[PDB]
Write a protein that binds this ligand. Structure first.
Ligand SMILES: CO[C@@H]1O[C@@H](C)[C@@H](O)[C@@H](O)[C@@H]1[Se]C
Ligand SMILES: CO[C@@H]1O[C@@H](C)[C@@H](O)[C@@H](O)[C@@H]1[Se]C
Ligand SMILES: CO[C@@H]1O[C@@H](C)[C@@H](O)[C@@H](O)[C@@H]1[Se]C
Ligand SMILES: CO[C@@H]1O[C@@H](C)[C@@H](O)[C@@H](O)[C@@H]1[Se]C
Ligand SMILES: CO[C@@H]1O[C@@H](C)[C@@H](O)[C@@H](O)[C@@H]1[Se]C
Ligand SMILES: CO[C@@H]1O[C@@H](C)[C@@H](O)[C@@H](O)[C@@H]1[Se]C
Length: 310
């Protein structure tokens, strides 16, 4: 290890946002603060002068953004209340209004979060697990934080992946949410603007480790076409990837890169496609590492140890 790496909590929650290749990564330090490391033509920060929030130890972490003009980062308080750190260009970092709504979740709850694609308005959908194990949507459409749709029972402590896009032939957002059911299967729930929430659970993986991390992204939306990638930590201690490609659907499942036992993961993407995955693989014991995919080089390890580790 290194003194910087030692600051990073083992099995920390990880989230990330970006605008093309301008990247922000969020993780929890060993004292329970949430920090931001940044990539602007090089990695920086992740230090004790870059704290944006403070959360229970072991907190789930989720983030979402409009480019890097608006960023939101979600975690839990010590009383398992959903809370929000918010950044707006020219306003700085501040506490969002979410904690004020006092949404109490299961202590083992994960969190998923997205801005709704295809509008300039700041509309948010947040997904977490309540004490009855249901996955609950919470929303902001400008008028205060309100409960939205409840997506049904999931495994206690299930990972929660979520992504959102707008098809170019549609008048609204599409959302997909992935989590794990009591049978240990990995499933999809879907929302399209005219159908609303589909009733059916779609299976994407037959059996996965209990409470494995789950993270998803999308790229190249078009006329009734999308590309999606969903990542999870499998029983061979690697991140696996489930591909949705237009015309083929859920046609490829494969290992991507090794991780430490119970690593969390984050994924971002941009058009190309460029993929960046973040996780812990044992580098300096506790540092966060990056995996990359692009057309130029395909699958390649990226930054070995994110700030503050190096
Ligand atoms: C210019 O501000 C940076 O970019 C913002 C989008 C953000 O993530 C700030 O925390 C960092 Se700190 C230098
Ligand atoms: C306008 O409300 C802010 O942006 C919204 C999209 C949201 O995250 C609110 O909680 C914060 Se509170 C200032
Ligand atoms: C229009 O319906 C709302 O926005 C959709 C995009 C979605 O997130 C619905 O569950 C909620 Se219903 C509380
Ligand atoms: C068009 O299919 C839908 O959208 C895709 C992106 C996907 O999530 C399918 O499972 C559902 Se249901 C066939
Ligand atoms: C052709 O490359 C695929 O799409 C890339 C964007 C990527 O995510 C690869 O792992 C997969 Se491998 C089925
Ligand atoms: C050009 O640098 C790469 O793309 C950046 C956007 C970034 O994530 C770097 O760590 C990697 Se290292 C192969």
């Amino acid at each position: 290890s290194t003194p910087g790496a030692q600051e990073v909590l083992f099995r920390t929650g990880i989230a990330a946002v970006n605008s093309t290749n301008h990247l922000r990564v969020y993780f929890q330090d060993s004292h329970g603060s949430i920090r931001e490391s940044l990539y602007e033509s090089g990695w920086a920060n992740g230090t004790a002068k870059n704290v944006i929030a403070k959360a229970k130890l072991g907190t789930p972490l989720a983030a979402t953004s409009k480019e890097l003009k608006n960023i939101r980062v979600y975690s839990l308080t010590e009383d398992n209340v959903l809370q929000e750190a918010a950044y707006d260009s020219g306003s700085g970092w501040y506490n969002g209004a979410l904690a004020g709504a006092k949404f109490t979740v299961a202590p083992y709850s994960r969190i998923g979060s997205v801005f709704l694609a295809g509008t300039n308005a700041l509309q948010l959908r947040i997904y977490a697990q309540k004490t009855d194990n249901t996955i609950q949507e919470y929303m902001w459409n400008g008028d205060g934080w309100k409960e939205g749709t409840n997506l049904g029972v999931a495994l206690p402590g299930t990972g929660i992946g979520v992504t959102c896009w707008r098809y170019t032939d549609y008048d609204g957002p599409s959302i997909r949410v992935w989590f794990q059911t009591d049978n240990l299967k990995l499933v999809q729930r879907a929302y399209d603007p005219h159908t609303g929430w589909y009733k059916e659970l779609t299976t994407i993986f037959d059996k996965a480790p209990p409470r494995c991390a789950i993270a998803a992204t999308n790229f190249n939306p078009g006329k009734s076409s999308i590309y999606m990638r969903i990542y999870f930590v499998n029983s061979d201690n690697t991140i696996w990837q489930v591909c949705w490609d237009h015309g083929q659907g859920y046609h490829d499942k494969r290992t991507i890169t090794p991780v430490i036992q119970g690593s969390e993961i984050a994924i971002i993407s941009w058009e190309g496609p460029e993929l960046r995955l973040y996780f812990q693989n044992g580098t300096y014991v506790s540092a966060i590492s990056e995996w990359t995919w692009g057309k130029a080089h395909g699958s390649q390890l990226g930054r070995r140890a994110l700030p503050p580790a190096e």
